[PDB]
Design a protein around this ligand. Structure first.
Ligand code: HEC
Ligand code: HEC
Ligand code: HEC
Ligand code: HEC
Ligand code: HEC
Ligand code: HEC
Ligand code: HEC
Ligand code: HEC
Ligand code: HEC
Ligand code: HEC
Ligand code: HEC
Ligand code: HEC
Ligand code: HEC
Ligand code: HEC
Ligand code: SO3
Ligand code: SO3
Ligand code: SO3
Ligand code: SO3
Ligand code: CA
Ligand code: CA
Ligand code: CA
Ligand code: CA
Ligand code: CA
Ligand code: NA
Ligand code: NA
Ligand code: NA
Ligand code: NA
Ligand code: NA
Ligand code: NA
Lengths: 519, 259, 519
């Protein structure tokens, strides 16, 4: 059984923790629930750690007193189809392979599934580690609780004796790097300096061997990613988000200074050897928009190239860990600002961006966001009980599974079927425009080889490449973004029409140039 | 927000609690979750209580860290038909009135329903308090969470100015007495001497005015009836059961000495 | 009412039947249930048949005493969508037309449906008989019992006065030949010599007019295909299977000699005029793996061409009735061994194989097969009754319809939804790789015309054609195979990655050669 330690001993050296812990809703929660610090207390000085205390980062450290939230979190939504490739006619991006040719996502890009699996899915996807990591057997794919207990309880490593990224299966890639892990786990929260910069006190950084780092990580979406363990107050821990909101002064709601001030973030820094080491962002309110924006954003978490001169931008560069914190119509400016692109298209030769799940930046400015609605209202609603203590569901999933608690709790004028119908109207319309956008992108792409064989000039091809950047951006945002337009229907529509317009312009340019060579 | 107290100071006087608390699965649970002892600590000696500390007996004291058990407990099983008289042809004892004639159960004896309602149901049944206590309105019969929060949040007393047992409705009885309450609540666990014997330190006993006692009681089936709050270990608190098992030497399984 | 005949009279001449019948579980079943032999007994000699006895091959001959098995067999699974073309974006092979161009399956290839319909579906499919045979009207498509009673009770023939294969509808083919029928019916079991070789006593053979043969056939999947009618013991009757297992000595489990010996096959031959005529394969155990492998295998049942010199291989050749009895990674060797390919691709000119439903050869080596699981455990499970005599369900269908009897009977650790989720993980992953494999095959195929117009050398085109064979094989196995990887997930994955690798190699080769002509 646990035996409490004297927190006053700790508070002598840990004044920020004292301030947070004594004032918040965990003032009665003893340190032993999460730290084994006996040898540390015997050996530390005011400025030197001595022996490192052991800190629990498993989610069961919180389940101890918060079983309802834990159990809701670890539920597996079996209706969220697993390992479902997006580059298929029945999924989100039927022409993805042609359009993304040159990028690692061509090797595999599945739809998301339940949060329990985030770390294991990151480890096993064909694009990440060359097939090095696999489930121990095909039964383990169902085991959400097991994945939560730890990735290495359900996975195997093809070669524990080597730590290099390489291909073990032929049609895999090795895109994973240390920055990725920040959106899969925070088991490394005490071992990673802010932004992944090099730091004497950091075991891991942007430039680490990712296979070695992987082996040290266990748990998905730790509870403390949104809740400070010392104050129990709302927070974020993700460096890239704090960097956008606070360091760059963009605010929590970059389009609304008033809401940014009311629902702000305060950066708190922790030191090692009296040098800044790590940071968190305490929130003014329990604002799920900002909590979920730790991960559900467009980002760089990867090497790339400069738009200006094509030079390589490696993991050592700060730009390899970057939150753009820009809506679709501000993204090109944001990427030009940091002088960055992701890949060159394998057929067209265009420098292109790679977009990922920009839910937060899409939600901005929507009617829902402007009315003060937040992600949790639809995806983590309060549970309605005839008799009981209310709590917040932590099963982050589609509102279709809890329409009474989600949509219908605000939209009294609708039946469930009516609300579903409104969702589907938007998704169906948006998906139609995604498909048309892909049709036109593909038409343009297929003209590049014809133009090259016809002897069309490099000047014309470069004009078309510039159009490809925009055609790509204004399409891929929406295959990347998970709501199929629901989060911001008007923006999806305007963007996708812009994509089609750009592709059409490029098609006309290339066809005319080919015709003139003939011729 | 709760602020923890120095448990080690309490332990300088409370040695049994120290032994229980420090060894069990509540060793990290601070006393402030259940006791407001500020004035007590300022005034007590090992031999004199001084100011009485306030002890929480509401089930929400435990729901704080054990929501799953609390929420399962307070669920109302709507299929457990409520206020269903047993002395009817379609229930358990069709000829009960003839057979029980002379006993107060002839006035009303319903089937049991969900535990959330035990104390309110005891208070309002026609055989118990002469009809003195009633739900505030007929809607409140559904409110299990409300009953758990406290009986007096959902009930009324026909005459707060008197404390005698009497009939307010013609076909009622006044069978309730203080002993009954021991199977409805343990809100009185610090105010009732073992067995309900007279005791200088007991506010309530077998001979108390049951209407006055009733008014001091709120919560059904307190969580600590089965779980010691200090050790978190399994227990009973009911005097009559301890008396049978231990005092009278009958054992927990009278027909199996080994068990 | 039936009147029994004196079996001892028959046993005087039929000593193999005596031996089988007197010892097995049909020792009390009189010959009159299946044979009208009165005139035969009056006219036969020890070595000459005399008048031919009439043998019942309708399934109702067995339903008489085995109603439960009959009724389960004839059930129509309405959820098995009928006449559903595979070459569509929502089915198994979205790019099948491009990839299979040159082959008769381009005319129509639907998903399988319930067994009751196998013979009628063979007769009416657009690729088989030029549209000659059709349902009497569109209502008859529902009539499983009717199809079982006989094909010609529910079908019409456009021209009873001619027996040639020809097109009656414009977009049909005439691919059917006598070998096909062996996997649709065994009504011809006494009229077809082993392998379909020419034989004095055979009415039908590989070289027969298929339209004439068709008209003589009635019943699907006769009960006696798996159960000897004389001993009631387990067997196979399909010549090609016996040829692989016994004649070629490959065994019932070619990858496991021990299991092959324990679960073997004994070839029993019947003569006409004291010349070998037909054969059956008695099984040591009631092994559904081998029973179902009568049909759910990759085979030749068709003319083709030699790999060595391109010469025609006609129906007269033994190779026109052949079970390869090889896994996907052994198939190229098996086809080279018999010097055979199916068609030349209409665009690339590559000699290609045509694969069909290799379920048996895929299942080998899977975790399930290695643990002693067999087809019936998932597709013909025992029926669970609260009170009753257990029998084996003969409704061969997806285990999704009987998860308690199938998966969950072995996998106690799972709920139904969890087991379904495990299936879907595999199928979704496998289907994604099928789609990607098709993407790369199509990319390669489309380069052939460009390369030809560019003047790329025949040597380079032939190199690419050799790659096409492999790219094709390692893809088409999995669109042909019905489990979408579930039967052997690891093999599907390795094969499909090999397909993509081969196509990519060919794309690079062709693009480089085109570029060099330009450059
Ligand atoms: C002064 C003598 C200290 C005592 C008393 C305690 N800690 Fe400590 N700790 C101390 C230092 C100088 C550091 C390094 C960081 C810094 O503030 O300079 C630490 C670090 C920790 C950590 C972080 C460990 C990691 O992996 O990075 C933890 C979790 C921690 N300390 C906990 C802790 C506890 C629970 C204590 C009371 C039981 C405690 N510390 C006492 C210095 C001192
Ligand atoms: C029992 C010993 C606890 C452990 C272990 C954890 N928490 Fe806790 N938490 C506990 C209490 C008694 C309370 C106060 C309840 C109240 O409503 O007063 C809390 C509260 C929280 C909250 C709510 C915070 C708020 O400001 O409203 C959160 C978000 C929370 N706790 C989270 C949390 C996490 C993430 C834990 C693991 C790191 C964790 N708690 C452990 C008791 C206990
Ligand atoms: C936070 C800014 C992220 C970073 C950094 C990385 N990922 Fe991610 N990932 C993130 C979210 C919010 C989601 C769910 C929404 C979605 O669109 O999928 C994902 C999902 C994945 C998955 C599962 C789906 C799939 O693509 O197959 C995988 C396998 C995955 N992510 C891998 C991955 C890799 C290799 C990364 C570094 C190169 C990486 N992620 C970074 C959020 C974030
Ligand atoms: C961000 C993605 C979250 C993670 C990770 C966890 N929780 Fe959470 N929690 C989150 C939100 C948006 C809310 C509601 C805030 C509001 O005021 O509306 C909560 C709330 C809680 C609480 C408070 C009680 C309740 O409302 O249920 C607790 C005790 C809590 N969360 C616990 C908890 C645990 C144990 C987690 C890991 C299993 C966990 N949270 C993760 C957002 C996020
Ligand atoms: C000695 C100086 C004491 C200290 C320090 C604390 N308590 Fe105490 N307590 C003391 C006495 C002499 C008594 C009377 C009963 C007895 O054992 O003789 C008490 C009583 C209590 C009670 C029971 C109150 C009731 O309703 O009957 C409680 C719940 C209690 N004490 C709690 C408590 C706490 C939590 C303390 C530390 C904060 C504490 N006591 C200190 C003597 C002394
Ligand atoms: C949070 C501050 C708590 C309060 C308030 C209560 N309990 Fe508790 N309890 C808490 C913890 C951290 C644990 C240990 C969990 C573990 O498995 O290690 C417990 C445990 C219990 C148990 C199980 C005990 C055992 O098996 O020995 C019980 C029965 C229990 N708790 C009951 C309980 C009651 C009835 C409470 C109100 C009087 C109560 N707990 C409050 C944390 C917290
Ligand atoms: C524990 C030994 C008990 C004592 C003392 C009293 N009651 Fe009780 N009561 C007890 C149980 C276990 C049950 C549920 C099972 C059942 O058979 O009903 C009850 C139920 C009631 C009810 C509800 C059902 C009904 O009879 O209408 C009422 C109204 C009730 N009890 C009243 C009551 C009175 C007035 C008591 C003292 C005279 C009394 N109970 C004592 C357990 C125990
Ligand atoms: C609106 C036209 C009503 C309809 C239809 C139903 N009820 Fe009603 N009820 C209504 C009002 C305005 C009130 C008074 C509310 C208050 O607190 O002032 C009620 C009251 C009841 C009660 C309590 C009766 C009592 O205490 O004497 C009950 C048990 C009740 N209502 C139940 C109920 C049922 C089950 C209904 C459908 C059969 C129903 N009501 C319809 C208004 C309206
Ligand atoms: C010897 C005089 C025979 C008697 C008595 C019976 N049969 Fe016969 N049968 C005989 C011969 C020589 C042959 C040809 C094959 C051979 O073994 O040489 C047959 C053939 C049959 C067949 C096959 C018919 C077909 O279509 O190929 C059957 C089904 C058959 N015989 C059945 C049968 C029965 C049921 C008899 C007793 C009533 C019986 N035969 C007697 C020779 C002789
Ligand atoms: C009644 C006159 C029968 C006819 C017609 C058919 N079968 Fe039969 N069968 C019958 C009996 C009395 C038995 C024995 C039952 C037992 O369990 O002892 C059987 C058995 C079978 C078996 C089981 C064989 C085994 O070795 O376990 C099978 C597979 C079987 N029968 C199949 C079968 C077929 C395919 C029939 C039509 C050709 C057929 N039977 C007819 C009785 C009768
Ligand atoms: C056994 C080795 C077979 C031979 C010889 C032929 N077919 Fe077949 N066929 C077989 C199976 C096991 C299945 C079901 C599984 C599947 O993948 O479909 C089928 C199915 C058909 C169908 C229905 C589905 C479709 O393709 O439309 C038809 C129309 C069909 N088969 C026709 C057919 C023809 C024309 C054949 C000779 C050229 C032929 N089959 C041979 C097994 C076997
Ligand atoms: C009565 C007003 C009808 C309604 C309503 C439906 N059907 Fe019908 N159908 C009707 C007749 C008189 C016939 C001809 C029957 C005959 O054998 O002479 C039919 C035929 C069909 C067919 C066959 C079509 C063909 O072969 O070309 C089909 C497939 C059919 N009917 C299906 C069907 C469906 C599914 C209906 C609801 C959508 C339906 N029919 C309605 C009369 C009537
Ligand atoms: C191969 C594709 C089969 C065909 C055709 C038929 N049956 Fe079958 N049968 C098959 C299997 C795999 C089994 C189970 C074997 C085992 O021991 O596990 C059976 C079993 C029977 C039995 C035995 C009793 C029982 O288990 O149900 C009987 C009587 C039987 N089969 C009858 C039967 C009939 C009447 C058929 C045509 C409708 C038929 N079988 C076809 C495999 C195959
Ligand atoms: C008993 C006759 C089985 C039936 C019916 C099903 N499965 Fe099975 N399965 C069985 C065994 C003995 C094993 C190996 C267990 C071990 O850990 O040694 C399995 C394995 C699987 C697997 C893992 C496959 C792999 O890793 O390659 C899966 C995904 C699986 N089983 C699923 C499954 C499904 C969904 C079933 C119904 C369609 C099913 N099994 C039936 C035994 C038996
Ligand atoms: O209190 S923290 O800064 O060590
Ligand atoms: O790869 S992750 O960003 O979706
Ligand atoms: O007995 S059989 O060989 O005619
Ligand atoms: O054509 S049959 O083999 O599927
Ligand atoms: Ca999903
Ligand atoms: Ca990006
Ligand atoms: Ca009841
Ligand atoms: Ca089917
Ligand atoms: Ca073939
Ligand atoms: Na979904
Ligand atoms: Na609002
Ligand atoms: Na094209
Ligand atoms: Na009941
Ligand atoms: Na199907
Ligand atoms: Na086994």
């Amino acid at each position: 059984n646990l035996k409490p330690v004297d927190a006053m001993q700790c508070f002598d050296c840990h004044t920020q923790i004292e301030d947070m812990h004594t004032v918040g809703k965990h003032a009665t929660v003893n340190c032993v629930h999460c730290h084994d610090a006996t040898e540390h207390v015997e050996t530390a000085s005011s400025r030197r750690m001595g022996e490192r205390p052991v800190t629990r980062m498993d989610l069961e450290a919180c389940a101890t007193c918060h079983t309802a939230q834990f159990n809701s979190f670890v539920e597996v939504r079996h209706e969220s189809h697993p390992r479902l490739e997006k580059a298929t006619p029945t999924s989100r991006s039927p022409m993805f392979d042609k359009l993304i040719a040159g990028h690692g996502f061509a090797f595999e890009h599945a739809e998301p599934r339940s949060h329990a699996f985030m770390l294991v899915d990151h480890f096993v996807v064909d694009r990440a580690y060359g097939g090095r990591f696999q489930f121990k057997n095909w039964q383990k794919v169902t085991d959400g609780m097991g994945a939560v207990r730890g990735a290495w309880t359900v996975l195997t490593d093809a070669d524990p004796e080597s730590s290099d990224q390489r291909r073990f299966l032929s049609q895999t890639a090795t895109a994973a790097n240390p920055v990725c892990l920040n959106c899969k786990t925070q088991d490394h929260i005490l071992d990673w300096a802010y932004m992944g910069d090099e730091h004497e006190a950091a075991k891991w950084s942007r430039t680490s061997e990712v296979v070695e780092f992987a082996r040290d990580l266990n748990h998905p979406l730790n509870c403390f990613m949104c809740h400070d363990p010392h104050s129990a107050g709302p927070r974020v821990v993700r460096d890239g988000l704090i960097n956008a909101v606070v360091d760059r002064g963009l605010g929590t709601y970059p389009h609304d200074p008033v809401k940014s001030e009311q629902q702000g973030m305060t950066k708190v820094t922790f030191q090692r050897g009296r040098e800044d080491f790590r940071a968190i962002g305490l929130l003014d309110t329990a604002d799920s928009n900002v909590m979920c924006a730790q991960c559900h954003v467009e980002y760089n978490c990867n090497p790339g190239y400069q738009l200006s001169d094509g030079s390589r931008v490696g993991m050592d560069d700060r730009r390899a860990n970057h939150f753009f914190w820009a809506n679709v119509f501000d993204y090109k400016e944001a990427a030009q600002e940091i002088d960055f692109f992701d890949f060159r298209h394998a057929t067209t030769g265009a420098a292109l961006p790679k977009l990922q799940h920009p839910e937060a930046e899409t939600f901005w400015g929507s009617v829902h966001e402007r009315n003060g609605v937040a992600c949790a209202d639809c995806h983590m609603p309060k549970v309605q009980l005839e008799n009981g203590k209310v709590y917040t569901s932590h099963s982050q999933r589609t509102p279709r599974d809890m329409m009474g608690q989600a949509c219908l709790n605000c939209h009294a004028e609708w039946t469930e079927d009516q609300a579903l119908y409104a969702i589907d109207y938007i998704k169906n319309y948006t998906h139609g425009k995604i498909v048309k956008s892909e049709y036109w992108l593909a038409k343009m792409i297929d003209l590049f080889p014809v133009a090259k064989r016809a002897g069309v000039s490099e000047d014309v091809l470069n004009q078309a490449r510039e159009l490809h950047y925009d055609a790509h951006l204004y399409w891929e945002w929406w295959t990347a973004e998970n709501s199929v337009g629901f989060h911001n229907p008007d923006q999806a529509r305007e963007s996708l029409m812009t994509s089609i317009s750009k592709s059409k312009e490029a098609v006309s340019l290339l066809n005319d140039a080919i015709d003139a060579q003939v011729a």
